[PDB]
Amino acid sequence: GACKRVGRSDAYATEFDLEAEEYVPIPKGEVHKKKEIVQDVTLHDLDVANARPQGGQDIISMMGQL
């Protein structure tokens, strides 16, 4: 359920002559890829993940102090 904007396809690179946009080539491979990944975690990673909201959940953490 993760997703990322890689950019705007450079077939649109001339929508305008200047725009604040990151034009990238269309993917040259298959549009769908299936990969076997063996993923490791530790019981401590589970401790940390269950004790407190982590990463992009904990945006207020940017304030530091408490």
Binding site: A11, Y12, A13, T14, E15
Partner: peptide, 11 residues
């Protein structure tokens, strides 16, 4: 009937 011409909208 010479209505076979086609325009485009891609940049």
């Amino acid at each position: 009937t010479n209505i076979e011409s086609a325009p485009s909208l891609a940049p």
